[PDB]
Amino acid sequence: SPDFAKLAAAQGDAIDSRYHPSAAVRRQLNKVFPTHWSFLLGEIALYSFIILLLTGVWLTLFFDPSMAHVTYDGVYQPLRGVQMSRAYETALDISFEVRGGLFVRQVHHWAALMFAASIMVHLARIFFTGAFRRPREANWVIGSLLLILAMFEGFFGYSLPDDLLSGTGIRAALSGITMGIPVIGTWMHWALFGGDFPGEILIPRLYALHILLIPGIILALIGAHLALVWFQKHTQFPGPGRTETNVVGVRVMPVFAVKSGAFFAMITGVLGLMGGLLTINPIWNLGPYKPSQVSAGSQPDFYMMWTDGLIRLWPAWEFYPFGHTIPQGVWVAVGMGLVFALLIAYPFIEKKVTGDDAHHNLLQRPRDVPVRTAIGSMAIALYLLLTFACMNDIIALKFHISLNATTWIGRIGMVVLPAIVYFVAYRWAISLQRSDREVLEHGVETGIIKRLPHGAYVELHQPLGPVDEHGHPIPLEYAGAPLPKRMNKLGSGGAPGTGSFLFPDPAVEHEALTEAAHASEHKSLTALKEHQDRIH
Amino acid sequence: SALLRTGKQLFETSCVSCHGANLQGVPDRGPSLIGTGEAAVYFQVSTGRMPAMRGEAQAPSKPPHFDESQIDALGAYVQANGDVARGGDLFRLNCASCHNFTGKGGALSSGKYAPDLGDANPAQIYTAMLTGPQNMPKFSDRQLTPDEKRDIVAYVRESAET
Amino acid sequence: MHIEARLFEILTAFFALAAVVYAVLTAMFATGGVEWAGTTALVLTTGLTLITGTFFRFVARRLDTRPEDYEDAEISDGAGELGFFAPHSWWPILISLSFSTAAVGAALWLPWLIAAGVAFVITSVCGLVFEYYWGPEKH
């Protein structure tokens, strides 16, 4: 008969006799992580990367990456007898002649998009809350290379099927930008193609980079990135027990081994629904990449859309300084290389500007930094403008505007719109600060009016602390608190009466589940209050 | 029937540039064919920005806008779906404002005459009437029965030839 | 609350007098038959001031003389509480944007943006309704 208690004790004595992971494990388990919703945004990019591993190891058991020409003679009826590369025929064998291969192919593209979206959402959590300061300067730099490597990993990914829609993206980007670089010339163009476009060793070179070379650097950087946040510990917003040298939150073994394991089950469950329901990349509609053909919607994915929108907005500015020429593509290769330079080296050009070079462990709330919130929201508004000018032909057809006037609202807008998002966010972040001082001077502005007996409509503010015989109470200090604005979020709503959604409980079991519920949170309140007074 | 392999390769060679089942960004795109069929998707739209694939008075040649077998094949590929005098008078009433006077409502210079319609024939007119045009509301199913469409097409054709 | 209800019972006495007269004078004197596009909107605008009008009559027949209805009441009669009034909320800005992104799509005929606009309405009408009923968090 099985026991699973004596069998689990003698296994732990066996591990602790061979090895000795007793003091080593307990410090890892007793690791305290802050519970906050924003601190799970980096786990989506960590969990979408594991899905790209598992559905990408599958997807290379069926893909043949060559460029050798072969007629189809398979199962898809429009593409019969079409001269295609073998990279495109096996990409049509995954979709059609592998049982549930279209599903794993579509999951793998949506997991590629959830990856490169939740890196951008995670950059915005790091930027505005200020998690890149003194100890974590190099964790920004290790981080911001993973964003640049995720741009090129996905761009080398959808270029593997050798679609017509996805082959003109290579002809635009890798064959137009690399051909007009003034630093060395076109000498690089024969070094990453092996000849003229398309050559013969394009896709087997983009299959090597995309499997081992770039995900061997991404996984090596992630391993040097989650092992920084593990050992220099995680930051926290200021609050009741948060005093710049604590980590107030929850431990690892009972909690956060569950809510970070169940969150991996729910990120994967979304990509199961999105990978099965929503179609992502039909490479069977537009046929193989033949250079005579044409596609009316030649657009990259949304992480590479700001690069295509940058080419469309720069005007036709060439130079001709000598007998040689300098094309329009110099303004993108120095435009892409300057965005990637002000995004890697940002925390070193705020230590120089502000001068604040002290060891910061408490995050700062993004309404309390009105300039860097306004520099940041300038950059979202400039990113959103470039990615809404790369799809201007779809804005032309569907939204009925123009195809000529969507660049002039982009090229004039590239200067005007990030100038007025700076003003409407610097004056927004300061007015959010003034809303936090009205809830401290006067209190939580509730709704109850109560006409006094001589007129005099008042609003019966809630004092949020000690009271006084004067009308407004003693004013509190700010100290980075979130400061609840509504009275239902404080203790004024109340329980709806325990029971089912249709039938109640017999009210002896109701007063026991609300006396032991208003005292189980009152025990939680005097716990931090008797810990905040121990520090101060 | 029309060969759908030829239809796919013709779509890729000549229409993929503005249409990936979507519509061309520049100006106004033709868009996805509504009620796609040989009768309307086959009938060209020379008027407007869209170029004219079929060339009138054209002998077999290597350089050509479209091929009778090529047209049918592409119209089919896009279309996956996955009293003659009495008829003319009725067309004038429904389309009396623009068709009447044989002229064009959008442009006074533009006309419904064969020179304006180039290589016109009854089938091409019937087809554009059925689903109407890029700027003209479709008439089949929605407004006019097949006899009425046939009669109005014949009246317009006889008026333009004479 | 008498002359709040009588204000809606004079209008429904006029519109019923202006829908009987309009239906009869277009029954015997119009150039064709009875005109329906105007007598519909007059039988239902004496239905506007009859759903509203008879509801104010049922309320003025149940309520006593409140301090507004008395002729010369002192100002010290409203010593109680007025009620609840939302002091500030960013939910009306996000219902107007959500209903104007289901009307751009209804104008341009984009079914992918009507159905994205209807779902933005419901997830923001949920925000305005549920705003003063949440309770704290459970952590």
Binding site: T35, W37, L40, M114, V121, I267, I280, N281 | N22 | -
Partner: peptide, 30 residues
């Protein structure tokens, strides 16, 4: 269009909404 643009639009309003909206239920607000 049916390529990367309505698919990229459907990422942010379906996928990342139901990946942030989950994290606001698992996580806290402080």
């Amino acid at each position: 269009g049916f390529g990367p643009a309505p698919e990229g639009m459907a990422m942010w309003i379906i996928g990342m909404v139901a990946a942030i909206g989950v994290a606001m239920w698992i996580g806290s607000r402080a």
